[PDB]
Amino acid sequence: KITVPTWAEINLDNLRFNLNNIKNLLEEDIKICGVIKADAYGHGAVEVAKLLEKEKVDYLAVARTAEGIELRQNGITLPILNLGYTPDEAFEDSIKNKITMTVYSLETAQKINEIAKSLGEKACVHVKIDSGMTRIGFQPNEESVQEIIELNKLEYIDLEGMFTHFATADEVSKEYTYKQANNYKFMSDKLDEAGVKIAIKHVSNSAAIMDCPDLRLNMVRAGIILYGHYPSDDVFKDRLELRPAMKLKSKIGHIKQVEPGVGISYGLTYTTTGKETIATVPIGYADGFTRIQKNPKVLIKGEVFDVVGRICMDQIMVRIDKDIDIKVGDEVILFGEGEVTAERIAKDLGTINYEVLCMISRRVDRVYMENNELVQINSYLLK
Amino acid sequence: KITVPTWAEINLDNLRFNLNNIKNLLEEDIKICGVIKADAYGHGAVEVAKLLEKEKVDYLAVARTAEGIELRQNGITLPILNLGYTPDEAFEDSIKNKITMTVYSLETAQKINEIAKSLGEKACVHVKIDSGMTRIGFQPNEESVQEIIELNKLEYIDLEGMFTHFATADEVSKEYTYKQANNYKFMSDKLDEAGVKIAIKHVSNSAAIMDCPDLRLNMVRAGIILYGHYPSDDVFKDRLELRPAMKLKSKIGHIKQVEPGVGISYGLTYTTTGKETIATVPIGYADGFTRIQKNPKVLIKGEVFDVVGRICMDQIMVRIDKDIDIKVGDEVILFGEGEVTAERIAKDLGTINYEVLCMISRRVDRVYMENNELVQINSYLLK
């Protein structure tokens, strides 16, 4: 089966578990969007979507046209929303591929409308509101109320949805978040006033789903929690119980004994003290195991070990100070188990777990496990 | 043509320029191995090999079996070396695809042979000597020589080459490097003494190529210089002229004016002081524009601007203070031009230009320019 040295193992049961737990927090009538943007946060968008189809999620969310197109190429039938910007050049492909678009200007809706009209297709859109992330969206005002009314008028535009996103929900203070909600409420009340039916309204991310039950609306958007990681440590964790789905793994490729005072790797930034046992592992920075780390660690045979020297593009060196029966080809865990977590690496980096998950590079095959079985291998390099 | 928001643009003319100069440094006998591990350090391996084949390089190098196989699968016929570890699981595929394997043990060589025997195909190998980077390779001792002698005696092994790698060649002092060279010399002398023929002997990287003219053997391996970047700032730069080949480009997707005192993006880490023009660009950390950056910058319409806020997965915010005529849709350059360099980003990060080049995500399409013409677009996601 696995012919790569380094790979990412995704446990399907875990995803199933997480989602079901997610469901137990929701009333029968709240739609779930599974956010699988960025190759499903590194987990593999196509496979996750398949799973999400099996489990009857309502919506899928992507960041890019191609990302959605990818799923469609692989026979995904669920509804897809592109959470972000769609260049004019992609409008036509979006329509043809049934990618719901996000819009924050009437101008855009008009170009889209022109294209759909040409194709004799109604193009479906979701309107973003800027409630204070200040990233994309209509500003929450009367003009924008009018602009939206005009938008909804266009034929060849089906204004399915309206949504906003939250800056601060993962944090302890929800003041900004509720303030963000009112601004959305303002847009909602007004368009409703003007008789504009928007079928799906949604504002909640993972943190909001956990922390903020009064914010359901039509749909919620789950991202990180789907993969068994928390948004922050300040969310109400007891509310939702999670297993991480991913392990980053590798194999010992060389092991040897090194004399005292020998330097390792580029720059010779480490030297052995005494005779040391050194294992080389074929993962490096170009796999997404970043050189920036500083206190990089690995798990072998249940023991944590320090990565010594400079991390190379394709390789790392590890010191074996505990004594254990190891040999070339034994498995190594970079994160995903025990003490080695995406969270740990992230803290060391000063980034967030989301980035570390996303970091896994193209050449790392994604290997899928179900009921403790290898069920699927995906290469991004090979046919 | 380009339907993606964010792409990497590769100038072939630049690679050709870079190679030529490199070629200009060498005798009419010294082989070049084009080192294209990690998707050609991110520039797209297949396309880069194609060019390399066109300009007649001798050998190609990669980090993984699949990287080699990807090339083969794309019609590349040049000899390929996997500089790294090969798993047992991958031996059959290497033999079949004409991938030269690096070997640093007799035991692994026997295993290869046994496999080569059953396929009826001679398996071609290069032996790695550990001369002081302590990564992979034989220890340079007599016992090693003996084994190599033994190795060479195996039937479906063609021992084509021997090589080592340098830790500190990019440094001002070359004491370690020459020290490393001697160890190799030792191995090479002993083996000649034993009459083991060894067709290609090689040790030099880009740095050695530039500064260490005496270390050509049969072949030198060029990586970083091929892409028009320097291994370190301490090399003899003026001995080789380079143009960088890659540009990370995105497009403006939202512009707005922001009231004073208003927070942007995650955790509201930036607050607006007065009325500020803010552009939203569809690149983020999951494209490899890492969140880790303390001082992210972007260049638009000739001018550099600060990225403001925490970087998102797929999005950033840019503060436009100087006045220029900009329109949603206009191009944005993250790196590859002028003041915005990979080196800058690297310095900020605390890393090296090599990692930045590598960080480019799967979803960033690779766009190839020749003669000021777009000539090829590549999606890693579609088709």
UniProtKB/TrEMBL annotation, chains A, B:
BP-aspect Gene Ontology terms: D-alanine biosynthetic process; peptidoglycan biosynthetic process
GO molecular function terms attached to this record: alanine racemase activity; pyridoxal phosphate binding
Pathway in which the depicted protein is active: Amino-acid biosynthesis; D-alanine biosynthesis; D-alanine from L-alanine: step 1/1
Catalytic activity: L-alanine = D-alanine
Alanine racemase C-terminal domain: residues covered: 245-369
Family of this protein: Belongs to the alanine racemase family.
Protein name as it appears in the record: Alanine racemase
Organism of provenance: Clostridioides difficile (strain 630)
Lineage, top ranks: Bacteria, Bacillati, Bacillota, Clostridia, Peptostreptococcales
Name of the gene encoding the protein in the UniProt record: alr2
